Amino acid sequence: DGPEKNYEKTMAILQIEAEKAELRLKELEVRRLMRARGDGPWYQYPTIDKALIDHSPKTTPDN
C-alpha cells in the first residue's frame, strides 16, 4: 500500500499506547492515594454496621 497508510496507523497506535501509559501512571497514583487516605470507593475495609445497635430502653438507666 501507500507509505501514508503505515504513517497514519503508526500515529493511531502511538496515540493509543501513550493514552495507555498515562492511564497506567494515573491508576497507580490513584490507588496509592486511595490506600493512603481511604477516602475513595477502593480500599473501603468494612466496619461494624450501626443497624445492629439496639436503641431500646435497657435495664439500667445510665444505658
Place this chain on the structure above:
Amino acid sequence: SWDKDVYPEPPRRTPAPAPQTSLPNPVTYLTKIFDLLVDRPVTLAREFIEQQHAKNRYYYYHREFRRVPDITECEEKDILCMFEAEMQWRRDYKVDQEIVNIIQERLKACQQREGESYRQNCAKELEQFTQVSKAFQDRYSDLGAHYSARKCLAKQKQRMLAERKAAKE
C-alpha cells in the same frame, strides 16, 4: 541527463592529432574496427529498444513531503508531534547523507580527472568537502546507534551553551 550544476565537469580540452611519423597508427585502425564491429550493432540495438520504449511512454514522480514542525516546537509528551518531527528529521538526515555523498563524488572525480596535478587543481573541491564534512560532523556525529531528533536537539543545545560561554569570555 544529470544536472551539470550538481556534478560539475570542466570543459574538455583534448589535444588535436598531429602525427609526425608516416607509420600507420594501429590505434586508429583498431578503433575503426571496434566502431564497425561493436558500436554499430550496439547503437542499432539501442535504437530499436529506445523506439520500443518511446512506443509506451509512462511517467514516475518524485514524492514531495511538506515541512512539519520540528522537535523544538513540540510538547513534552506530544507523541504525535514527536513522531512527525522524528520522521522529518530522519528524512533530513538521509538527505544530508546524500549531499555528503554528492560532494565526495565531486572530490573523487576531481582527483581522478586532474591526473598528476590533482593536489593543486582540486583545492576547491577539497575545501567544499571539508566544509560539508565539518558541518555534518557537527550535526550528525556521536549520537550513537539509537539516535533521535531529541538527541540532535540536545547536542545543539550543548554546542550553543559552549558558544555562549566562549562569547562571554
